[PDB]
Design a protein around this ligand. Sequence first.
Ligand SMILES: [Zn+2]
Lengths: 183, 110, 96, 47, 101
Amino acid sequence: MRIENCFFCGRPAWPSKGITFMRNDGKAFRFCRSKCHKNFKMKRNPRKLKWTKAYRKNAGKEMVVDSTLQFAARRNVPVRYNRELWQKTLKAMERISEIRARRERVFYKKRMAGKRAREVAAARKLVAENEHLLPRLRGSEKRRLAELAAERGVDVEELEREELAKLASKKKSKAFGGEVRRV
Amino acid sequence: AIADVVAREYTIHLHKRLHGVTFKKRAPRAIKEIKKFAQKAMGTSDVRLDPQLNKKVWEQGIKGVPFRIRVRISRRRNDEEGAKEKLYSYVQAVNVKNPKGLLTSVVEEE
Amino acid sequence: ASTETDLTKKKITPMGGFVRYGEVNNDYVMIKGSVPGVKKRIMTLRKSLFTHTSRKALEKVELKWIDTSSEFGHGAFQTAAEKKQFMGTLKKDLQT
Amino acid sequence: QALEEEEERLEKEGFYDEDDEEEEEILQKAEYIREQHALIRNEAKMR
Amino acid sequence: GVFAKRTMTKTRRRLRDLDQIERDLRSPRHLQQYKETKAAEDLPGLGLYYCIECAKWFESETSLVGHRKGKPHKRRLKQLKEGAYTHEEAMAAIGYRIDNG
RNA sequence: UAAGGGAAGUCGGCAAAAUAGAUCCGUAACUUCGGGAAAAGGAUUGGCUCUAAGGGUUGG
RNA sequence: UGUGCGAAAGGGUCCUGUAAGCAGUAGAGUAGCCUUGUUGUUACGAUCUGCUGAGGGUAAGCCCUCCUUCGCCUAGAUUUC
Ligand SMILES: [Zn+2]
């Protein structure tokens, strides 16, 4: 047996999975699932459906140029069976898989490099426009810190900073409404 | 170990409790499952809902009940004379940014 | 669930487990066809009362492959490693 | 063998080499601001 | 509007595909085979007025020049300009190939 | 709602499905010349950005 | 009193199909300001591209989780040679 691939989306097609369409010109179309089969019957383009490997290649979101992608091919010239060749092939398959995985991760990071700079710029703009929503001590808490600093001879700004630390550590959500007392 | 008067915040997954329910009955059943959840959590058969919690349930009509709702249930003492139940639960809706990703928490008394 | 021609090291349990059952961690019996019960149900296996008369009883079974894809949907992968290898890197992979 | 030679060449060149407190603080403050905006929108949706 | 939209996706209502349309445009022998598959006397306008892009027969030259101004013909032109989806593109999408020696 | 088939069903296509608005091409026999006729058979219809035509008053 | 039960949550597995928002010498054209055109410029503008197989849902008859949190427990009532 062998593992085929879906014509429409590109997923691995295993035995008894999906359905094959035989056309009168002599071409056969293997689909992994009824989703791909029904989209094909609705004449949707796989290149425009964003969940397909066709779209991902056309958008450049899959690693398409690599040395590790040259090892798998449809071999139309058979090789006489050789036990040593098959075992070294299996070892090659493992090593190729590992190398391909690391190179794919590098490719994804090179796609996603600029995110940190964009997010930092957006955060700076948001903070600059909304400085007034930053956490703040209560007026009663400020007065109590001021009188405690006057009593203990300590720094009111210092007391304010550890109180900001405490109210930053303690997160309390507010509830809607409230019970009405019965008569 | 746990006192009679106690408030906890819970996340009720109303989606699995309203799966397959008739459209004209989804929101009233949601009210009843909120009462049943509070009774199971606090042991109190007397459950009183906040009108804001009712608005939160009914916000998108009779069949647009949210999948998750973040509630605070407060078990309190019934001080009214001649009361069959000495304890009751009061359930309020909680203002959180997103009802997902939250654990059951105990509300501080202060 | 590994065979002599499929060298993938894997157990009989599908991805995501058996639907409404769980995971098979004990010895299991694979039976051609269907059986009278449902999932979770107690099955009684019995020896045949008579000597068999068919060649199918004397046939030796050689498995080439066992499906271990998910039965909670249209599963296309036999292992989670295969799913990761096909999909590639995700957003949560860099976030973690 | 060619793949292994290319791989060791790339590791020598730093192909697989992987790489601020002020940035972390400004991101945390932005997340706090977004949470406050969500709470304000929830109050409006309630009322 | 689409005539009998309920059974549009049946196999007995199937239309010619865009890759076959590309083959018909590039090679006249393929189009000749497709036309020999049909009977000319039962065709609209005796088969004399045919749009290869829309893979469709028309009753008159006025009708054919008429549909050419319409948007279905223009969407077919746009899809042909983009290119039909084929097996070699499907193979390149997964990075697979054929070794013929 | 239903794959494939498409009246094989039934006394009987009963019931259902199919058609349908508008613009344009086009429209037979028959006829009391008025009709038939929306006969039949076809092409098309979204969004957006534009262009053109269709008026009134004042001014030498 | 447990390899317990329940409510959440995390992970998985599936379904859909790429979220809000921001940005772009992408964008048919149109109108202003001036260097009167040299992406002239600014503005509007379906859509496209990137952030983004993302966002959302997931047991209600899916799976895993002494070792991610919180809670519950040795009852109550009735009957029996
Ligand atoms: Zn597929």
